[PDB]
Design a protein around this ligand. Structure first.
Ligand SMILES: CO/N=C(\C(=O)N[C@@H]1C(=O)N2C(C(=O)O)=C(COC(C)=O)CS[C@H]12)c1csc(N)n1
Length: 159
């Protein structure tokens, strides 16, 4: 995979908004959103966050991520981690997570990256573990049907 990255642009919105394939996927990556996802919801997120970044391979936008919390000299918290359905398991998330770790270190002088992953997302839990994130706490949250879910709060020192 010959991946590159750059800040997200207006022209990328419609592509990225296409990535979540069902309510579960949308909830795992953006729990405040409402299905169906839309460019307007994505742009709202981008406006209130920092670091929105796309990953590109062979002229295609295949991944997106940003920070929903950032604290200079401290930590950032990774959000909106989305991958195109034709590129799942090919290393795009792993790549973009590395890019975002660098951006957190270099631009925000972060010592830590935080990632919160919902219990049902096994693939995410195992990816973040492979990348060196450790579980720190479990929080009770609710899904769109009002059912209780467990949010696993993980972190990793940067360097
Ligand atoms: C105010 O806090 N309430 C939360 C909560 O922790 N939201 C946070 C947020 O924004 N996150 C994103 C996010 O929107 O980016 C992701 C997605 O993480 C990745 C790695 O894609 C995982 S949950 C976290 C919450 C969650 S469910 C619920 N009923 N409340």
């Amino acid at each position: 995979m010959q991946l590159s990255h750059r800040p997200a642009e207006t022209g990328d919105l419609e592509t990225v908004a296409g990535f979540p394939q069902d309510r579960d996927e949308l909830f795992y990556c953006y729990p405040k959103a409402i299905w169906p996802f839309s460019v307007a919801q994505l742009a709202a997120a981008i406006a209130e966050r920092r670091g929105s970044t796309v990953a590109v391979h062979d002229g295609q936008v295949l991944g997106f991520a940003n920070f929903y919390q950032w604290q200079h000299g401290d930590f950032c918290a990774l959000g909106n981690m989305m991958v195109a359905p034709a590129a799942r398991g090919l290393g795009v998330a792993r790549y973009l997570i590395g890019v975002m770790e660098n951006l957190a270190r270099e631009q925000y002088k972060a010592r830590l990256m935080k990632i919160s992953c919902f219990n049902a997302n096994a693939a995410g839990l195992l990816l973040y573990t492979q990348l060196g994130y450790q579980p720190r706490a479990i929080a009770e949250r609710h899904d769109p049907d009002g059912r209780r879910v467990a949010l696993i709060q993980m972190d990793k020192p940067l360097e």
